[PDB]
Amino acid sequence: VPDYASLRSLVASSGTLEFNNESFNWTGVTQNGTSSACIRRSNNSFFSRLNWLTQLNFKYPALNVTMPNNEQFDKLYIWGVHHPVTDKDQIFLYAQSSGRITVSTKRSQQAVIPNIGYRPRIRNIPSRISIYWTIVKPGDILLINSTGNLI
């Protein structure tokens, strides 16, 4: 978590972990991606609150998606970026070499490039996940544009 201490402190300051589902128009994606790294019910799994995205059929449409907040309370969104290890790993996960993520509000924006890198394997995993947090005020539209690598 880049600026780990901050996010931690903010969630700590909330005092709640109430979560609501939302059906994004995640399309043409192989979602519900698995890894033997994370074990649930003696199965290959991933994180609970998050979703890992993989390519479908050697192909990946870029994901141009929105969410309105027409309600009277702020939405705290959590996402991440995968760090693929090799060019060979890259084409396997996202089927396009160049990774790029853009998220925005009406009042702020954030974008991060994935840095393909060979890292030391904690728990036999050559990869990491970078975690950021985007607050949204009401009457704003959290939009996400991506090329992959998006949690």
Partner: protein
């Protein structure tokens, strides 16, 4: 986040310290005045008797 959190700390630090600090200053002077007034009463009292 983190930065903002610390100056909220800095703020509350100052106000709390000053608040207590002022509270004492006030109370100490009040006592001093009440002392000085009745002491001068005592001083005039003594002047007469002496």
């Amino acid at each position: 986040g983190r930065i903002q959190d610390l100056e909220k700390y800095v703020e509350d630090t100052k106000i709390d310290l000053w608040s207590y600090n002022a509270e004492l200053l006030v109370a100490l002077e009040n006592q001093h005045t009440i002392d000085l007034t009745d002491s001068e009463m005592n001083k005039l009292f003594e002047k007469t008797k002496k």
